[PDB]
Design an enzyme around this catalytic site. Structure first.
Site, PDB file in Angstrom:
ATOM      1  N   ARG A  62      41.003  96.446 131.606  1.00  0.00           N
ATOM      2  CA  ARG A  62      42.275  96.306 132.310  1.00  0.00           C
ATOM      3  C   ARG A  62      43.215  97.486 132.056  1.00  0.00           C
ATOM      4  O   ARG A  62      43.058  98.228 131.084  1.00  0.00           O
ATOM      5  CB  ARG A  62      42.992  95.031 131.888  1.00  0.00           C
ATOM      6  CG  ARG A  62      42.571  93.775 132.618  1.00  0.00           C
ATOM      7  CD  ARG A  62      43.282  92.550 132.031  1.00  0.00           C
ATOM      8  NE  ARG A  62      43.031  92.432 130.593  1.00  0.00           N
ATOM      9  CZ  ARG A  62      43.920  92.720 129.646  1.00  0.00           C
ATOM     10  NH1 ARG A  62      45.136  93.136 129.975  1.00  0.00           N
ATOM     11  NH2 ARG A  62      43.583  92.627 128.365  1.00  0.00           N
ATOM     12  N   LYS A 210      41.660  88.186 135.597  1.00  0.00           N
ATOM     13  CA  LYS A 210      42.910  88.076 134.848  1.00  0.00           C
ATOM     14  C   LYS A 210      44.144  88.057 135.742  1.00  0.00           C
ATOM     15  O   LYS A 210      45.190  87.553 135.347  1.00  0.00           O
ATOM     16  CB  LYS A 210      42.999  89.192 133.812  1.00  0.00           C
ATOM     17  CG  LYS A 210      41.927  89.094 132.721  1.00  0.00           C
ATOM     18  CD  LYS A 210      42.018  87.746 131.995  1.00  0.00           C
ATOM     19  CE  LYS A 210      41.053  87.661 130.820  1.00  0.00           C
ATOM     20  NZ  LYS A 210      41.305  86.452 129.972  1.00  0.00           N
ATOM     21  N   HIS A 229      44.532  80.328 127.388  1.00  0.00           N
ATOM     22  CA  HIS A 229      43.545  81.377 127.204  1.00  0.00           C
ATOM     23  C   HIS A 229      42.645  80.853 126.088  1.00  0.00           C
ATOM     24  O   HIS A 229      42.768  81.256 124.930  1.00  0.00           O
ATOM     25  CB  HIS A 229      44.233  82.684 126.792  1.00  0.00           C
ATOM     26  CG  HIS A 229      43.303  83.850 126.698  1.00  0.00           C
ATOM     27  ND1 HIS A 229      43.389  84.788 125.692  1.00  0.00           N
ATOM     28  CD2 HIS A 229      42.252  84.220 127.468  1.00  0.00           C
ATOM     29  CE1 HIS A 229      42.431  85.686 125.846  1.00  0.00           C
ATOM     30  NE2 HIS A 229      41.728  85.363 126.915  1.00  0.00           N
ATOM     31  N   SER A 247      41.044  88.736 122.669  1.00  0.00           N
ATOM     32  CA  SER A 247      39.759  89.312 123.015  1.00  0.00           C
ATOM     33  C   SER A 247      38.922  89.667 121.786  1.00  0.00           C
ATOM     34  O   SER A 247      39.450  90.138 120.777  1.00  0.00           O
ATOM     35  CB  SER A 247      39.959  90.545 123.890  1.00  0.00           C
ATOM     36  OG  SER A 247      38.710  91.110 124.224  1.00  0.00           O
ATOM     37  N   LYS A 251      35.793  83.220 121.354  1.00  0.00           N
ATOM     38  CA  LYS A 251      35.917  82.084 122.257  1.00  0.00           C
ATOM     39  C   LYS A 251      34.626  81.826 123.027  1.00  0.00           C
ATOM     40  O   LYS A 251      34.210  80.672 123.168  1.00  0.00           O
ATOM     41  CB  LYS A 251      37.051  82.286 123.259  1.00  0.00           C
ATOM     42  CG  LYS A 251      38.429  82.475 122.664  1.00  0.00           C
ATOM     43  CD  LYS A 251      39.515  82.489 123.752  1.00  0.00           C
ATOM     44  CE  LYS A 251      39.412  83.700 124.675  1.00  0.00           C
ATOM     45  NZ  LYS A 251      39.520  85.006 123.955  1.00  0.00           N
ATOM     46  N   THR A 252      33.997  82.896 123.523  1.00  0.00           N
ATOM     47  CA  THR A 252      32.761  82.763 124.295  1.00  0.00           C
ATOM     48  C   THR A 252      31.521  82.530 123.451  1.00  0.00           C
ATOM     49  O   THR A 252      30.757  81.608 123.731  1.00  0.00           O
ATOM     50  CB  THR A 252      32.536  83.962 125.257  1.00  0.00           C
ATOM     51  OG1 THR A 252      33.567  83.961 126.249  1.00  0.00           O
ATOM     52  CG2 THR A 252      31.177  83.858 125.970  1.00  0.00           C
ATOM     53  N   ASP A 266      37.027  80.658 128.918  1.00  0.00           N
ATOM     54  CA  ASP A 266      38.176  81.557 128.891  1.00  0.00           C
ATOM     55  C   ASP A 266      39.513  81.102 129.460  1.00  0.00           C
ATOM     56  O   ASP A 266      40.562  81.475 128.932  1.00  0.00           O
ATOM     57  CB  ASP A 266      37.765  82.862 129.576  1.00  0.00           C
ATOM     58  CG  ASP A 266      38.710  83.994 129.284  1.00  0.00           C
ATOM     59  OD1 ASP A 266      38.657  84.508 128.152  1.00  0.00           O
ATOM     60  OD2 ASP A 266      39.493  84.365 130.187  1.00  0.00           O
ATOM     61  N   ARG A 330      30.085  94.195 129.442  1.00  0.00           N
ATOM     62  CA  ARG A 330      30.136  92.790 129.785  1.00  0.00           C
ATOM     63  C   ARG A 330      28.989  92.385 130.695  1.00  0.00           C
ATOM     64  O   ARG A 330      28.119  93.184 131.029  1.00  0.00           O
ATOM     65  CB  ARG A 330      31.449  92.492 130.519  1.00  0.00           C
ATOM     66  CG  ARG A 330      32.712  92.731 129.715  1.00  0.00           C
ATOM     67  CD  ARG A 330      32.970  91.588 128.752  1.00  0.00           C
ATOM     68  NE  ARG A 330      34.233  91.749 128.042  1.00  0.00           N
ATOM     69  CZ  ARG A 330      35.054  90.750 127.735  1.00  0.00           C
ATOM     70  NH1 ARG A 330      34.758  89.500 128.080  1.00  0.00           N
ATOM     71  NH2 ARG A 330      36.168  91.002 127.066  1.00  0.00           N
TER      72      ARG A 330
HETATM   73  N1  LIG Z   1      31.332  85.804 112.917  1.00  0.00           N
HETATM   74  C1  LIG Z   1      31.542  85.968 114.234  1.00  0.00           C
HETATM   75  N2  LIG Z   1      32.151  85.038 114.991  1.00  0.00           N
HETATM   76  C2  LIG Z   1      32.305  85.223 116.286  1.00  0.00           C
HETATM   77  N3  LIG Z   1      31.909  86.277 116.975  1.00  0.00           N
HETATM   78  C3  LIG Z   1      31.293  87.219 116.199  1.00  0.00           C
HETATM   79  C4  LIG Z   1      31.089  87.114 114.859  1.00  0.00           C
HETATM   80  N4  LIG Z   1      30.434  88.214 114.369  1.00  0.00           N
HETATM   81  C5  LIG Z   1      30.251  88.968 115.404  1.00  0.00           C
HETATM   82  N5  LIG Z   1      30.745  88.461 116.562  1.00  0.00           N
HETATM   83  C6  LIG Z   1      30.826  89.233 117.865  1.00  0.00           C
HETATM   84  O1  LIG Z   1      32.216  89.350 118.245  1.00  0.00           O
HETATM   85  C7  LIG Z   1      32.409  89.161 119.646  1.00  0.00           C
HETATM   86  C8  LIG Z   1      33.166  87.912 119.892  1.00  0.00           C
HETATM   87  O2  LIG Z   1      33.313  87.917 121.285  1.00  0.00           O
HETATM   88  P1  LIG Z   1      33.855  86.971 122.437  1.00  0.00           P
HETATM   89  O3  LIG Z   1      33.140  87.515 123.612  1.00  0.00           O
HETATM   90  O4  LIG Z   1      33.709  85.538 122.117  1.00  0.00           O
HETATM   91  O5  LIG Z   1      35.417  87.317 122.615  1.00  0.00           O
HETATM   92  P2  LIG Z   1      36.280  86.308 123.457  1.00  0.00           P
HETATM   93  O6  LIG Z   1      37.166  85.562 122.515  1.00  0.00           O
HETATM   94  O7  LIG Z   1      35.485  85.571 124.453  1.00  0.00           O
HETATM   95  O8  LIG Z   1      37.293  87.485 124.186  1.00  0.00           O
HETATM   96  P3  LIG Z   1      37.626  87.565 125.802  1.00  0.00           P
HETATM   97  O9  LIG Z   1      38.838  86.798 126.168  1.00  0.00           O
HETATM   98  O10 LIG Z   1      37.806  89.038 125.896  1.00  0.00           O
HETATM   99  O11 LIG Z   1      36.454  87.102 126.531  1.00  0.00           O
HETATM  100  C9  LIG Z   1      30.997  89.135 120.210  1.00  0.00           C
HETATM  101  O12 LIG Z   1      30.563  90.494 120.404  1.00  0.00           O
HETATM  102  C10 LIG Z   1      30.208  88.526 119.033  1.00  0.00           C
HETATM  103  O13 LIG Z   1      28.838  88.919 119.043  1.00  0.00           O
HETATM  104 MG   LIG Z   2      34.980  85.566 126.483  1.00  0.00          MG
HETATM  105 MN   LIG Z   3      39.906  86.432 127.943  1.00  0.00          MN
END
Ligand SMILES: Nc1ncnc2c1ncn2[C@@H]1O[C@H](COP(=O)(O)OP(=O)(O)OP(=O)(O)O)[C@@H](O)[C@H]1O
Ligand SMILES: [Mg+2]
Ligand SMILES: [Mn+2]
Length: 534
Positions: A62, A210, A229, A247, A251-252, A266, A330
């Site tokens: 973004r 977004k 979020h 981010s 979460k994912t 999300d 992504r």
């Molecule tokens: N202990 C951990 N817990 C969670 N995620 C981890 C951990 N160790 C490594 N990771 C990595 O960190 C990232 C967590 O990413 P995630 O995609 O869930 O972000 P998100 O909260 O969904 O952000 P967004 O809103 O940008 O989607 C991933 O690359 C995951 O592989």
């Molecule tokens: Mg995510």
């Molecule tokens: Mn997000």
């Protein structure tokens, strides 16, 4: 004129529309992206996983500096403006005049072309959902909105009347920007009187995702519906859990749990009936993606999923570890690419567990701690997380209100208010999880983090004996099933508890300095007591 004739797009100001590809199927999109004719960023490539990968161009994320919202009689007194007395945000005002100029650039750019038009929904519930019509000239972009938004049924398209229109003019830029006082030639503008979104210069699909989220973050809280979020899932007993976080926090990866039914990953709302998903797909991060560590996400990468900015070797194989173009690689995929999900509508009951995810690079916060009601609000408005900027040397903090400041169209306290109301009515319990680092200098493993989430979800954390962590005053468990007791107390991961102490004082000070801007009101000034203390 009934159907979706070119004469209907003329109302939007688009002219000489030759061919209109309305609601393309996944197969149509597949052949469109692989067309050998295609040049530049429009060109997709086929990977050994059967999924096509594209390049989003110069913009691989973004561009908040290019976001503007038209200030008129509809948005003036309600919006959380960046130039108003209220907090630091990206809601930059834009005149209707400059809007019309930008609109002219977009409609002209989309005139006399073959246009992809995707009709969809934003929000699983018909009473609060937005009927959005996306228009683009790039196939992979219409693919992205097909994956990410709610795909309507044939019977729904029959009576489909859009509430919002988003015109993606990625190929055009604004040459008169300097004269208009904008950040650059690029632009991501919104007009709530016309109910439209214009995009110019940036190819990044996330701006549309977004962008609609930002609109939901405006309309819903004004109706008493929380807009969040967060990811979300349900258990067989029907217990719903929501995971907030900035981010990269998890979460994912963490909501994608085979033992539980995935609601969304999300964007969700929370009304009188419960928690509901806004989207129709997921947008996972792929850097250093491990099929062993995250098998569900890995198996979702197949035909119909759209890879972004990943590096594909000559033999078609993907090098998930290569972050040369960007660390923000992504992949989007329709939600059904995950086996265990809520079908056919992505919604569930009221949440009872509210988890706040944070990746603490300072190595101060504990893996898990149960929060009190006042700390829930304090931390919600704080929205802390720290990356590790320094080729990972020197942790750098980020405080983003409500865990998603970049998408807020209203003042942060307005979101906290509606969130607290929903949590109360459900007797929801809040927790804070450090998916980040500790005194070891290494991030906590996904295995250990999943075990902690299970303990929270199964109740064994609520029954655990806890003691108070100093300074932050967090109730941390003495022990927990499945995890190593040594990591539960952040101080144990340092050679001497004095190291923790020093770093803890630094972090506490940052929190205090940050929350100060909220103390303007008695409620927020009251909350300072719920924060750290030296
Ligand atoms: N202990 C951990 N817990 C969670 N995620 C981890 C951990 N160790 C490594 N990771 C990595 O960190 C990232 C967590 O990413 P995630 O995609 O869930 O972000 P998100 O909260 O969904 O952000 P967004 O809103 O940008 O989607 C991933 O690359 C995951 O592989
Ligand atoms: Mg995510
Ligand atoms: Mn997000």
């Amino acid at each position: 004129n009934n159907g979706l004739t070119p004469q209907e797009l003329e109302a939007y100001g688009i002219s000489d529309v030759h061919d209109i590809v309305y609601n393309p199927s996944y197969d149509l999109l597949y052949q469109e992206e692989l067309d050998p004719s295609l040049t530049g960023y429009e060109r997709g490539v086929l990977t050994n996983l059967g999924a096509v990968a594209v390049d989003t161009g110069i913009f691989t994320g973004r561009s908040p500096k290019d976001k503007y919202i038209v200030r008129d009689d509809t948005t003036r007194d309600t919006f959380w403006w960046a130039d108003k007395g209220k907090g630091k945000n990206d809601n930059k005002p834009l005149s209707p005049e400059t809007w019309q100029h930008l609109k002219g650039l977009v409609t002209r750019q989309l005139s006399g072309k073959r246009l992809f038009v995707v009709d969809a929904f934003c929000g699983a519930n018909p009473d609060t959902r937005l009927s959005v019509r996306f228009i683009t000239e790039v196939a992979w972009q219409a693919h992205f909105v097909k994956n990410m938004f709610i795909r309507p049924s044939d019977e729904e398209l029959a009576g489909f009347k859009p509430d919002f229109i988003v015109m993606n003019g990625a190929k055009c830029t604004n040459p008169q920007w300097k004269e208009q006082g904008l950040n650059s030639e690029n632009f991501v503008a919104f007009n709530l009187t016309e109910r439209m979104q214009l995009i110019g210069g940036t190819w990044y699909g996330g701006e549309m995702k977004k962008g609609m989220f930002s609109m939901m973050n405006y309309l819903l809280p004004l109706k008493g519906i929380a807009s969040m979020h967060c990811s979300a899932n349900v258990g067989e007993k029907g217990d719903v859990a929501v995971f907030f976080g900035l981010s990269g926090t998890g979460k994912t990866t963490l909501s994608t749990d085979p033992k539980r039914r995935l609601i969304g990953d999300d964007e969700h709302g929370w009304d009188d009936d419960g928690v509901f998903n806004f989207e129709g797909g997921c947008y996972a991060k792929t850097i250093k993606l491990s099929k062993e560590a995250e098998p569900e996400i890995y198996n979702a990468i197949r035909r119909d999923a759209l890879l972004e900015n990943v590096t594909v070797r000559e033999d078609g194989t993907i090098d998930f570890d290569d972050g040369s173009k960007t660390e923000n690689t992504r992949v989007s995929y329709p939600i059904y690419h995950i086996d265990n999900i809520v079908k056919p509508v992505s919604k569930a009951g009221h949440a009872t567990k509210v988890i706040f995810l944070t990746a603490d690079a300072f190595g101060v916060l504990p893996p898990v701690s149960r929060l009190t009601a006042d700390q829930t609000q304090y931390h919600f408005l704080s929205g802390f997380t720290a990356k590790l900027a320094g080729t990972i040397t020197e942790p750098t903090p980020t405080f983003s209100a409500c865990f998603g400041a970049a998408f807020l169209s209203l003042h942060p306290t307005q979101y906290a208010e509606v969130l607290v109301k929903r949590m109360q009515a459900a007797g929801a319990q809040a927790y804070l999880v450090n998916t980040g680092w500790n005194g070891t200098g290494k991030r906590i493993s996904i295995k250990d983090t999943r075990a902690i989430i299970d303990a929270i979800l199964n109740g064994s954390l609520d029954n655990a004996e806890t003691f108070t962590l100093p300074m932050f005053n967090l109730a941390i468990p003495t022990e927990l099933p499945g995890v190593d007791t040594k990591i539960l107390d952040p101080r144990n991961t340092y050679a001497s508890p004095e190291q923790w102490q020093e770093k803890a004082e630094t972090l506490a000070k940052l929190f205090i300095d940050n929350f100060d801007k909220y103390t303007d009101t008695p409620a927020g000034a009251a909350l300072v007591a719920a924060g750290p203390k030296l």
